Amino acid sequence: KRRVVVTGLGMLSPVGNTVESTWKALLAGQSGISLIDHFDTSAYATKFAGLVKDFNCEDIISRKEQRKMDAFIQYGIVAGVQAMQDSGLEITEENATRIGAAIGSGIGGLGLIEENHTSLMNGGPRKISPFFVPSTIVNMVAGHLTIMYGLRGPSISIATAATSGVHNIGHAARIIAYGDADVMVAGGAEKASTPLGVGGFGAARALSTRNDNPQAASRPWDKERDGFVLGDGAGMLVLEEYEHAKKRGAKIYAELVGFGMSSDAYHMTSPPENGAGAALAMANALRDAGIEASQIGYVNAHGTSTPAGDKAEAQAVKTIFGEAASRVLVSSTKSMTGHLLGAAGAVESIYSILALRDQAVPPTINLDNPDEGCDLDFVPHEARQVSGMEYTLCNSFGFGGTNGSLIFKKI
Amino acid sequence: KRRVVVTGLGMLSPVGNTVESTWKALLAGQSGISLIDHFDTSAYATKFAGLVKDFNCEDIISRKEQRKMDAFIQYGIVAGVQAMQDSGLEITEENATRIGAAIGSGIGGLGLIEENHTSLMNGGPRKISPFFVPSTIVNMVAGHLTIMYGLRGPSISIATAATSGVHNIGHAARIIAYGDADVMVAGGAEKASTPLGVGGFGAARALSTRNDNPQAASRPWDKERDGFVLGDGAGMLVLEEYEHAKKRGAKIYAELVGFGMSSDAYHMTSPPENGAGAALAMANALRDAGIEASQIGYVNAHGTSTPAGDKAEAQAVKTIFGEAASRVLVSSTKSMTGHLLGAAGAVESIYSILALRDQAVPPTINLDNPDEGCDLDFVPHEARQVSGMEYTLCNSFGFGGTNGSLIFKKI
Ligand SMILES: C[C@]12C[C@@]34C=CC(=O)[C@@](C)(CCC(=O)Nc5c(O)ccc(C(=O)O)c5O)[C@@H]3[C@H](C[C@@H]1C4)O2
Ligand SMILES: C[C@]12C[C@@]34C=CC(=O)[C@@](C)(CCC(=O)Nc5c(O)ccc(C(=O)O)c5O)[C@@H]3[C@H](C[C@@H]1C4)O2
Structure with a gap:
């Protein structure tokens, strides 16, 4: 009868690049929504999104290694370390086998998909990067992280659109309770503020269009809503079995109960x-x-x-x-x-x-x-x-x- | 202490469009690998793949509805029905809540991703189909199928590259055993024989190049192998709890034990x-x-x-x-x-x-x-x-x- 507890957090959001800064801004009713600068939004019906401000991974990812990964992967790894660090967990040859990961993303490497397709359309399959597949596929955050930390336990990646985060966190818990793992980093990563992300959800008429006030665009339940607002970020939590956490006196934020x-x-x-x-x-x-x-x-x-x-x-x-x-x-x-x-x-x-x-x-x-x-x-x-x-x-x-x-x- | 059994199969493969035809061909050492015709493979280093021959979904998918889905989704739904039918299961208002799905795919709607990006590059975000997102995202087979059959139980989609199928089948079993579901359709669908699929894995130097003999290209463990061969298809199995199957005298192919x-x-x-x-x-x-x-x-x-x-x-x-x-x-x-x-x-x-x-x-x-x-x-x-x-x-x-x-x- 195993209980799952949270012993680590990490995140990157349109309102903060740490768990604490993000929480502070949210409690302070801060918006993160802003006008998009990274691409011509002239032709675009929606010209804003909740972007990750001044993202820096130099300390964590060798820009030589960054070439092999979409921003979503980058975002996710950065938030994963954050959580790995905040857990205080030390993976040991005795450990690795019982520490895994459950981390997905809704749309994946749109950015790099776009780059590689543009590339192909312009100069043929020759220009398609050798890193196309591993740089855009949804389970890559899981793969980089598991490697970086020597994690060898169960590793999965649930892609259930907006439900992804909850599924991975939930299935990570399940994995642990079942007895398959002892610790699991879980969450999701997304960076779909791209021409295809913005143009694509806008084509579905699912996006807000309040460009005169990007800050007021996201208004759940308000009579004036006109569709969702796109946000980039990554959320990761370290999940672990009660006794394994205690026995190591981990800081425990909560219990995952249902x-x-x-x-x-x-x-x-x-x-x-x-x-x-x-x-x-x-x-x-x-x-x-x-x-x-x-x-x-x-x-x-x-x-x-x-x-x-x-x-x-x-x-x-x-x-x-x-x-x-x-x-x-x-x-x-x-x-x-x-x-x-x-x-x-x-x-x-x-x-x-x-x-x-x-x-x-x-x-x-x-x-x-x-x-x-x-x-x-x-x-x-x-x-x-x-x-x-x-x-x-x-x-x-x-x-x-x-x-x-x-x-x-x-x- | 719940046991999971298999009570339905369905599949589409480069060697057959049914479970039985596919099995017959495999036992008969038949190859499915063939030269690619659907796109100019002149510039391509690999010009062949295991394709799904004469695929027809008219009976199952309204071509009006086909417009909203990548081939991978199409493939998956077709193989899902096959399995839903072969199970003999009849979803009832009393049932639906306890019948779910766990179905993913490695790369998703590359085909339609390509079409929409080409479209955007040529005539702007205006041309991006309103169905871009729901037609290419990895969990769509789960979504169409759950709808088509009135399934309301747990629905997830594991995207773990080549491991996807095993993960979804395994996690479907887990879902059932845990008590969350009674029946679960699970498997995977992929149709990555596209310019990005072929060009992309070829850029990684991961593909075979034996174009003079596509049939001999796939040669696991042979001293002459030069990388994998790409195959399209879908595999789906109906998983269910022992007693629930028995109580309905379902045909039972096997037991999922580990x-x-x-x-x-x-x-x-x-x-x-x-x-x-x-x-x-x-x-x-x-x-x-x-x-x-x-x-x-x-x-x-x-x-x-x-x-x-x-x-x-x-x-x-x-x-x-x-x-x-x-x-x-x-x-x-x-x-x-x-x-x-x-x-x-x-x-x-x-x-x-x-x-x-x-x-x-x-x-x-x-x-x-x-x-x-x-x-x-x-x-x-x-x-x-x-x-x-x-x-x-x-x-x-x-x-x-x-x-x-x-x-x-x-x-
Ligand atoms: C075909 C239509 C009908 C339409 C009508 C009214 C609406 O209000 C929206 C804009 C979205 C409905 C909705 O909430 N969907 C929905 C959902 O089931 C689950 C998740 C999310 C999410 O964002 O993770 C989500 O967005 C829909 C979309 C676009 C188009 C207009 O589908
Ligand atoms: C960076 C390099 C090194 C290289 C060297 C020798 C090889 O033999 C290959 C061709 C593939 C190794 C491999 O088997 N990978 C592998 C895997 O871990 C898991 C799954 C699959 C699958 O197809 O689901 C798979 O393909 C690799 C690939 C390409 C490039 C050449 O990576």
Whole structure:
């Protein structure tokens, strides 16, 4: 009967390049959304995104080695070290075999995909870099990190669009509990603010277009939302078995108590008005954690700020809490952070964790006027202290109707 | 204490468009490798691949719906139905919630990525299809299928390069055993025979170049190998809990008894001469299944026909079997099939299953002269009947040193 605890964090976000700086900015209702400079956004309908500011990996990645990896991989490795360091774990020949990784990404190396295709179109297969495949494939963060640290235990990479982070974190926990691993670095990495990332989700009409105020673009549940905002970043947490952590007196941020998955079985890029999918996922985590919706102090919504998106998640909240629907805090970090896709669920697992450490729940900024019949506490504009909140739940939903929820318990 | 059994198969391969036709061709030492016609391979160093012959989904996918999906997705859905049908399962409002999917792919919609980028480069973000994202992202087979069948249980998509199939099948089993699901469709789909797929792996010098004899190109363990051969296809199996299958008198092909994962922690696109990684993975499945290397009648090698690739897997065999190293049958379907990447481990989980049903183990064709110090039974040129083989093991290894092995038990 093994328990999984969190003994390390690390992250890179549009509002900070450390876990602490990122948390501080989120609690301080800071936006990270900005105008895109790295490419001509003239032809683009959306000209902004939550970018990672002044990213530097020189200390961690040999620029000779950087040539072999998309930014998403770069982002992920940097956030992985952060967490490896913050864990204090020392991998030993006796260890390696029982320390693994579960780290994916929604879209992968778009950047380098684009470079290599441009290259091919211009000068043929000759120009296609020898590093094309290993520099853009989704499981590369797992591979670089496992190597860098001599990790030899289980290594997997779940690519479930926006649900990725939650899935990897959840499946890492499962791996540990099952007995396959003792420690697992898990999370996601994404850097889809590229012509194909921006143009592509804009072609789907899924992006915000509020270019006169990029800062106000992300407004989950607000009556004025017009689609999500793109965000780059990486979120990683070190998960480990209770006794293995204790026996080494690791700093322990929390306990991963429940994990729930569901499927919408409705539409490829959209949820039932019903919110049936999200409920089942929340529903299953609760049954996994073995607690009740009443005990959930804060819900880090999937809330991407898309019209149908936000409404459906709300439906699921009511449905799941019913009574305590109005008494529960629910917010979207996406109001400041943007949508980190493959990394969203990872960075939000961290927020959901830090909210328990600090007994503070970050705001859903930009929430001027809510949707009508909403009875919920969307924790609008300004952060909000909480008292005896012992469990926080994290939601992440993805294209394909693949949903997932994680439950974190204090201590 | 839940057992996972296989109650459905389906697949599309360079040697067949059904499970049975594919098996027949493999046992008959048939190659599927052919010259590529769908694009100018003049500039290309490798001009052949194992392609899916005369693929037709009209019956299953509305060509209006086909516009929204890369071939890999198409391939996967077609093989998924096959398996859904062959299971005989009837999803009911009482069911849906306990039937999920675990289906990934190594590289995803390269084809459509290429089309959309070409499009953008030629006429701007305006031409980027609204279906870019949902038509190329790796978890789309999971999403279409879950919808098509009303599946609402857990849905995940492991993208671990060549290891994908084994991971999804393994994690689907885990999901079931854990109690999260009752039935799970799992496998992988890949259609990377594209300019970027061919040019890209060729840029890495990882592909064969034997264009005068595409049929002889795939030659695992042969002294003359010069890299792997690319293959398109999809492999899907319906996994389910013993009692749930029985209670419905499902046809049961086998029992999934063990699942092992490991990490090379060595090099991004290569294994230790040592084969340390593969051993650990085989090693863990054995401990998971709770049996010994002696009991493994046949090993479906990862054996991709790359110089270092094949040698390292052999090292791991000796290391793992030691004594019974010479008494165990080990082959590579890749000698006829090619490398199906994300689908390799799925289609090979099926072979490994059919080998137990038919007590026949398919050949490693093209194995004219083996590497020297090889003591192993690579099951060269011609198939080979077996007697009381009760367990077969399936190996799949991927870029990033992510390895995995599955163990199947008769009945
Ligand atoms: C075909 C349509 C219908 C349309 C209608 C109303 C909407 O509001 C949006 C903009 C998005 C619906 C939605 O929330 N999807 C959704 C989801 O199920 C899961 C995850 C995410 C995420 O961002 O991880 C997500 O975005 C949809 C998209 C675009 C186009 C317009 O599909
Ligand atoms: C940097 C180098 C070194 C090089 C040297 C010798 C070789 O023989 C190859 C051709 C491949 C080694 C290998 O087997 N990799 C390998 C692997 O670890 C896992 C999976 C697969 C698979 O196909 O799923 C795979 O291919 C490598 C590749 C290309 C280049 C030449 O890396």
